[PDB]
Amino acid sequence: MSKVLVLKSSILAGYSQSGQLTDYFIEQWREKHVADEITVRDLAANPVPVLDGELVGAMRAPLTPRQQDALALSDELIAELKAHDVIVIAAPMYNFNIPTQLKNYFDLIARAGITFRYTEKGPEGLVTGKRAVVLSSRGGIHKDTPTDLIAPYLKVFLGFIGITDVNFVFAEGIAYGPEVAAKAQADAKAAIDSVVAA
Amino acid sequence: MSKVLVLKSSILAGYSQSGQLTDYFIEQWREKHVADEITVRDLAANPVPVLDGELVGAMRDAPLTPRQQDALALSDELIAELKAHDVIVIAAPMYNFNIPTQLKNYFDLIARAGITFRYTEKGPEGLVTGKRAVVLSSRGGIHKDTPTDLIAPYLKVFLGFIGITDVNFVFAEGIAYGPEVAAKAQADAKAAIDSVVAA
Ligand SMILES: Cc1cc2nc3c(=O)[nH]c(=O)nc-3n(C[C@H](O)[C@H](O)[C@H](O)COP(=O)(O)O)c2cc1C
Numbered sequence: 315m316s317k318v319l320v321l322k323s324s325i326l327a328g329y330s331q332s333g334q335l336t337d338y339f340i341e342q343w344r345e346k347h348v349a350d351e352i353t354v355r356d357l358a359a360n361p362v363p364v365l366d367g368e369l370v371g372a373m374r375a376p377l378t379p380r381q382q383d384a385l386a387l388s389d390e391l392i393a394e395l396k397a398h399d400v401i402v403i404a405a406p407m408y409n410f411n412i413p414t415q416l417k418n419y420f421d422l423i424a425r426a427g428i429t430f431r432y433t434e435k436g437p438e439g440l441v442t443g444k445r446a447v448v449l450s451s452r453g454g455i456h457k458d459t460p461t462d463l464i465a466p467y468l469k470v471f472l473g474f475i476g477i478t479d480v481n482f483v484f485a486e487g488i489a490y491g492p493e494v495a496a497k498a499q500a501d502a503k504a505a506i507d508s509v510v511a512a
Numbered sequence: 513m514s515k516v517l518v519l520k521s522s523i524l525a526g527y528s529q530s531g532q533l534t535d536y537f538i539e540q541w542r543e544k545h546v547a548d549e550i551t552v553r554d555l556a557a558n559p560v561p562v563l564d565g566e567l568v569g570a571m572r573d574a575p576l577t578p579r580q581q582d583a584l585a586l587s588d589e590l591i592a593e594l595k596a597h598d599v600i601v602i603a604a605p606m607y608n609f610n611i612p613t614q615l616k617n618y619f620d621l622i623a624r625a626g627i628t629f630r631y632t633e634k635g636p637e638g639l640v641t642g643k644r645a646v647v648l649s650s651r652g653g654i655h656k657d658t659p660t661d662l663i664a665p666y667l668k669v670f671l672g673f674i675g676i677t678d679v680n681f682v683f684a685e686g687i688a689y690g691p692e693v694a695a696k697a698q699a700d701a702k703a704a705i706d707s708v709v710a711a
């Protein structure tokens with residue numbers, strides 16, 4: 315049995331394209347693995363705080379309740395990530411970057427000695443053995459163009475903490491009409507079917 | 513006479529590497545252009561809110577909630593400020609392979625359809641024109657021109673979209689390798705800054 319962790323980050327709630335893709339992933343995964351446990355963390359519904367001077371200080375004198383709470387949340391998020399086998403991440407493109415909702419999550423899980431460390435061989439990620447799937451929706455078409463810096467960035471960040479097995483699924487041209495959008499979702503769903511079947 | 517807008521984003525206050533670079537930039541600009549006015553907005557000291565579902569609604573009628581009203585007023589303020597200056601200095605250190613969230617929130621409030629960019633018969637076009645931008649980016653490690661630096665290309669893409677195509681990049685890398693290496697990195701960065709100021 316595998317445990318699947320789904321991280322939603324869209325700020326569009328019910329109208330989220332990436333959220334619709336994560337729902338499809340969950341639907342298909344539950345159908346294939348009826349015993350698998352799925353945990354969903356909606357980073358928009360339940361926001362993670364912005365990494366500021368006070369919080370970064372906490373992650374490395376007495377701590378204020380705010381700092382204590384943020385540290386506890388960081389621990390929770392990290393423990394949750396390490397406890398699951400399949401990590402599904404919704405990462406749509408907002409102003410050429412990922413949603414701040416997801417960025418805040420990354421800023422709290424990237425911690426020296428906890429999710430990565432340095433050895434005789436150099437930097438080594440500590441979140442091992444995971445299978446990750448990135449579901450990224452975009453209004454325009456950026457894949458394989460100089461304007462898509464989020465896919466490369468996600469690969470680098472995830473790799474740094476140890477998640478190197480990352481499948482990227484894209485749904486682009488969403489803002490170019492119901493036809494283009496519909497075909498984008500269909501090809502993304504086909505991509506998800508492949509991941510689920512793998 | 514030119515008006516310089518300096519955007520600070522480090523969360524390290526007085527220990528900020530990028531902050532120290534922006535201070536040098538300011539010091540040098542004041543030396544070479546004694547009549548220019550400098551405006552500084554510290555995005556850590558005076559934080560911009562996170563773009564959430566409610567706030568994005570504020571930027572496009574349906575009545576706005578009190579929070580959306582404030583967010584819209586802030587967006588207008590930030591945009592008016594950006595358009596009112598000639599030289600835009602942006603501190604953009606690398607935090608977990610991305611820029612600081614403090615700066616990202618600022619970007620999310622200044623990117624507005626019909627105000628900082630629009631669509632014409634020529635396609636998308638930025639509305640923040642005639643600007644000279646200078647990015648000051650410090651890193652603990654060394655990433656320039658490698659696959660681990662996605663911030664430089666991202667900044668060029670974002671700024672260009674709103675119209676700022678004239679962008680100079682200044683890097684200070686290897687800060688995490690000790691005081692000796694950091695000093696040389698700071699020294700080279702200051703030399704690059706001198707050239708931008710003298711241009
Ligand atoms: C605040 C905001 C900023 C956006 N910025 C961009 C952008 O820079 N480029 C692009 O192609 N689409 C952009 N979009 C369009 C979205 O990427 C597209 O609608 C995506 O499918 C939305 O996914 P969502 O439901 O998952 O979060 C933006 C949408 C919002 C709400």
Ligand SMILES: Cc1cc2nc3c(=O)[nH]c(=O)nc-3n(C[C@H](O)[C@H](O)[C@H](O)COP(=O)(O)O)c2cc1C
Pocket residue numbers: 365370521522523524527528529530531605606607608609610650651652653654655687688
């Ligand atoms: C939360 C946080 C994340 C960081 N992430 C990275 C990173 O991914 N790569 C790197 O080379 N340095 C990284 N650094 C090191 C900084 O880039 C370096 O110390 C920089 O000079 C800090 O500038 P600051 O005072 O200007 O904002 C990080 C520092 C902090 C506080």
